[PDB]
Design a protein around this ligand. Structure first.
Ligand code: R5X
Ligand code: R5X
Ligand code: R5X
Ligand code: ZN
Ligand code: ZN
Ligand code: ZN
Ligand code: ZN
Ligand code: ZN
Ligand code: ZN
Lengths: 515, 511, 510
């Protein structure tokens, strides 16, 4: 579709980098039991010291170089400790009279690294990659990691190493071309390499969409990006416009976008396996391209209206999952990637606080607050999802700011109507190392959504547990299907690092794959 | 006339039910001095006990049933008391060996029940109707009530009994019996109560109706339909006509709305010599966002602001009653400058200087004080009609909640006699109103440096008075009274409108 | 009796000025008929034009040719009568003596209101403050009744007077009045002087900072005043207050370094008493709001020395009553005085306390301390067996949103008493508007654990809710309540009005 402009300078597409520097890195995996070769670039050892905290550095691996081995001997390394995050640079000449660069990153004293500890290690490693024109990196694992944590290492490395310069003009300014990995039982880890590279881009793709400003990323331009992505992955796609949405009676969703200059666009991507189907899955993401709050404008102190381009993070995660799925191509499964995309703006055309609107399932809704627009969009999307006749419906959304008060910035919350699906989401959490916590849908609060005139209240008057109340509202639009709700309002944006996380991509993909 | 839409799913008319289940209730009034008979349905005795606070229940009236009488002996009822709001249900077999349902509502210990108390009696009575599949209700009055309070009982019964389900997707009684002393005089109050009931309930339907349904176009269409179902003269002034009349203050407010301004002018004329011409003016803001002075502050309650046309709803509800009852020797003008206060590129700005139809220039200090601007141009219009009385009713100021609260509306004005008539009408209609002053000392704070007058005050925080001072500037030589119903229009506890003003304005017109 | 100190530099008494320069002003009142003489000082004509912003015209005959020439229509039409506008010129008279002549515009409306007359006086006083005059002469070319005339003199005296007790690093001696029917107005002159000081005495107490005016020193002041006027007096200390079981009032004062002090002054007539009145004044020397601290924007904690304006008004009334000495009445001047502070000893939000009438009270907001002190004061008052009880208090900030800064609110349980107040408002020219005690709001004060709530959680009609509360503490006596929170302090002029002295005095005398 054509993107409407106010001025000719208004951008008419989202800039997207497909071919990243990371994709050009050749990755080699070796077994430690054959010894380490130390040559060009930077060679880093991941070292810990179990039990003794801040203990001295010891190098276990055999180094196939007499000079370097002498340098890395215990007597020399004892002056350094393994405090998690610590790093050191070494400079020396090898057996062939060439200058080599060696070093280590401390992995603390705990034998089992959490997904957070791993991130801290990688961030230390990225520091060594930044402001250094290296042609090759070599990593030597002298720590115990399982296959999932190893993959997570690579993904995190690839993600943090990458730098988004899509909107830089006058302020720019060499990535490595080779990445060597030494690890015990290397043959058992090689399979994770390309999985990591695929999970990397799915996450980085979502990141680009979330980071892109609302004048670049609007409902028309975003849906366009989905079409382009589907075309590149040979996914079936359907983009529903206003005329189709009207006949489908999506009144709740249509109301939210009334005050926007950009018409509503409902994204429907489908991946179907070439084998007989055993499971049908619907993935629904909240896709508000900008959330101004509507007439309930985000004007209160700490409402953070400048962050509100983030409000399509759920849609981004789902599209990123679409990349991972359409690339890895899982068998015997059919997936629907769905998003009701629109923009919540203030206008003469906007919907009002107090308005009564009718969702596609016939339920009438009294809007008590226009800044609770996400559940309204999701309502019509959930009805759409169930109509597809699937086994699982999973939605992911930056729905409630209360999540920052419940689980904070590290853990997402999962709600649902089916315990087994919840457990499946939680298993996907562990294998993707994207932390999620199970929160209740307390039915005692349901009565507060009883409207005097409408079928149901959008919001509660009394209950301050908005994350739970919102889940109660969504559950009203899934009649008889296993359904889960993931709230990523707290974890989607990395506040200290000033960038998106692309949270949800790897989690949803593990869910699809391990089922 | 055609309602503009953004999407096809947008409503283009206000759903209105005219024939309610309350209209299907056959009402009979008997005199108690002949006996009560029971039989079918539920029979409720309104009882009290003068003197003793929680004194025993004593059924004094004669019951035309040996069984029911034996059950209603003093000794049997002695265990019950008459605490205001107390209710009980009884089961027994009458002389016909048929199961009958009997009970009572406690009417306290005071000989003269108050408006607030009578509503408490009714609500307790309505509770008995909501959870039971009854085909008939019988109410026996063993308390003293005058004709007005009796009518009030019926109105309040009818109002609280009726349930609005216009906006829901996913068994009323058919008979009402009333036993009462001096029944023949109370009989005429019945159909008057039915008329007062709907005028009130018509108003509430409009107010309760959300702002996507009730817009300046649909509301004015509803008024035309009402005018046509009665036979009042009607004319809806459009933007073009309003421009020719130079109603700039009124036109400014609606600038940011997707709905064109509609000025409602209804007229009732008696078929005889007119001795009094009256102009009723209702504030008709279908939705009040506040304009660029957006309602964002804690406690501004923006999601309620569909009620900001309660003044118009009150005026239309009165038009129905007047249209139905057809009073004599009067000519009534039902006026409302309807528009919507929205945020847009076309909206008017704080600081803007606008020109009223009487030529006075106005400096806008706050866009959320928009009611008095539409009223100003409506008052100019009303006085040009050459009337004897101008009365406006409006949800104008939030300060009312801090002055009089949620029960008592405030009345302002430039003529004591007119105020006295409004206060009198407040008594007989049982819609409480308290007289508040227009303090002229505060007028100096409406002096502008550039415009002829300021919209809002600089220093004074008594906005309900300051607003009254602003309104008075647009009535040069006609008795005028102002009724602020911003405090009383919405029943917060019940989460519904009161339809406040309909009965007051009708009592004012009739008498 | 002895005022406690934290440091030796802390004040131990309220400075009071009794003999003011106003008392040194010799006032003569002449009839306009016969013409006006202009010989010394300033002569101001009070002129109107019944049109708007119309020209100035002097109707009165001036027995001086030079001034007459200055006052001819051709000269005066250059000026206008816009309410409060003034001009004055210096010139020589027939005797070649320096005189000053001018006018104050009185607008275009024939009957001046109390607000209008104040703007006129303020324009008059402006000329007084920047001219070294020996004599002011005011010629009334407007119509004023006896009451408005006396009100003119009181307001003139009050605005003219400058309080300088707290300043560290030449009033006129003669006042002349030309007015039609001068004889009927002369008797109002000395009454004005009395009403002025009663108002000024009160203002002196309100303006006095909270470190000067504390529970102890304020009660000490009341005794000093009571002795000068030969009124009997009684100051109740904490021990008495404890034996009287005044828990509501004692609770509020718990966090203060200053012990609670209950002021009880009594005026008795030599003639057989036929009416007994008790006047109750809110006496909070400082109101920080307690643990419910006044910390919200616009809570104006720096004003809160005014929170004893009610007590000041009562004492101001006591001066007038003791001076004019009315007959056949016994008046009781009451005030439960204390301070509302934050401390380890303070009363907390939530506390349930017992008033002297046995009613348990759940404290929902420590800043609503006024009604608690008033509760035990009203209980004390009824025990005196009086016919009328009138309390006057800076009780609710909501008054600023109802009536504003000019009209005080009056509540009550007896229609005749309220009307007597409303009439006193008319004759004292201190504006008061009747407000309703809505019984339908009473149910919000039903405590879950106490007999009654201190405040309402829902209803925002604070003045009415507070009226319902106080109503619970008067069982069988005519009682009226005057909320002067909005009108007590003159914000524009940055000073007290001493509001209520003249109102209550007119109530006692008439
Ligand atoms: N009680 C009540 C009332 C109205 C809105 C909410 C609410 O949860 N609002 C959310 C919203 O705007 N959804 O569209 C909302 C608000 C803030 C964030 N946020 C996340 C990170 C930083 N801020 C996320 C979602 C709740
Ligand atoms: N001084 C000044 C400044 C700006 C607004 C007002 C003012 O009176 N605003 C009113 C308004 O919006 N009129 O259109 C207003 C405000 C609130 C309510 N309210 C009623 C129930 C709950 N709230 C009603 C009317 C006055
Ligand atoms: N419900 C409830 C809660 C908390 C305070 C009040 C209240 O009315 N408080 C009054 C008080 O502090 N009394 O001691 C009070 C009295 C006067 C003002 N005022 C402001 C400016 C001029 N005067 C403000 C508050 C009521
Ligand atoms: Zn929102
Ligand atoms: Zn949102
Ligand atoms: Zn408004
Ligand atoms: Zn309004
Ligand atoms: Zn206080
Ligand atoms: Zn106080």
């Amino acid at each position: 579709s054509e993107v409407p402009q106010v001025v000719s300078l208004d951008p008419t597409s989202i800039p997207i980098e497909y071919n990243t520097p990371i994709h050009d890195i050749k990755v080699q995996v070796y077994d430690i039991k054959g010894g380490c070769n130390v040559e060009e670039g930077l060679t880093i050892f991941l070292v810990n010291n179990p039990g003794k905290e801040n203990g001295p550095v010891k190098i276990s691996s055999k180094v196939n170089d007499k000079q370097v081995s002498e340098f890395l001997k215990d007597e020399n390394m004892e002056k350094f400790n393994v405090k998690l995050g610590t790093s050191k640079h070494f400079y020396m000449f090898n057996d062939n009279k060439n200058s080599v660069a060696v070093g280590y990153v401390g992995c603390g004293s705990v034998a089992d690294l959490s997904e957070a500890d791993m991130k801290r290690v990688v961030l230390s490693l990225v520091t060594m990659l930044h402001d250094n024109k290296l042609s090759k990196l070599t990593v030597v694992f002298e720590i115990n990691v399982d296959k999932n944590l190893f993959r997570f290492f690579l993904e995190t490395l690839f993600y943090e190493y990458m730098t988004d310069e899509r909107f830089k003009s006058t302020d720019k300014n060499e990535y490595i071309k080779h990445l060597g990995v030494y690890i015990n039982n290397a043959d058992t880890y090689k399979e994770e390499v390309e999985k990591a590279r695929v999970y990397y881009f799915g996450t980085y793709y979502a990141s680009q969409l979330i980071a892109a400003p609302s004048n670049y990323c609007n409902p028309v331009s975003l849906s366009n990006a989905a079409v382009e992505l589907a075309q590149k992955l040979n996914l079936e796609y359907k983009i529903l416009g206003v005329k189709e949405l009207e006949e489908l009676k999506m009144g709740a969703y249509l109301s939210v976008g009334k005050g926007s200059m950009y018409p509503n666009k409902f994204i429907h991507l489908t991946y179907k396996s070439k084998g007989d189907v055993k499971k049908k899955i619907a993935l629904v993401g909240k896709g508000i391209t900008f959330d101004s709050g509507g007439y309930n404008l985000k004007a209160a102190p700490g409402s953070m209206i400048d962050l509100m381009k983030f409000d399509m993070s759920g849609c981004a995660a789902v599209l990123g999952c679409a990349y991972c799925v359409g690339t890895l191509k899982p068998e015997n499964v059919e997936i629907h990637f769905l998003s009701a995309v629109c923009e919540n703006m203030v206008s003469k055309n906007s919907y009002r606080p107090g308005d009564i609107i009718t969702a596609s399932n016939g339920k009438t809704i009294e809007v008590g607050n226009t800044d609770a627009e996400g559940r309204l969009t999701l309502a019509d999307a959930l009805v759409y999802a169930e109509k597809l006749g699937v086994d699982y419906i999973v939605d992911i959304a930056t729905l409630t700011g209360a999540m920052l008060y419940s689980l904070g910035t590290s853990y997402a919350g999962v709600f649902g109507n089916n315990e087994e699906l919840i457990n499946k989401i939680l298993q996907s959490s562990k294998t993707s190392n994207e932390p999620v916590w199970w929160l209740p849908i307390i039915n005692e609060y349901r009565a507060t959504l009883n409207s005097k005139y409408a079928d149901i209240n959008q919001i509660s008057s009394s209950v301050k547990a908005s994350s739970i109340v919102a889940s109660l509202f969504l559950k009203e639009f899934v009649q008889n299907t296993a359904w889960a709700h993931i709230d990523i309002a707290g974890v989607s944006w990395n506040f200290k690092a000033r960038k998106p996380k692309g949270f949800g991509v790897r989690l949803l993909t593990e869910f699809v794959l391990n089922d």
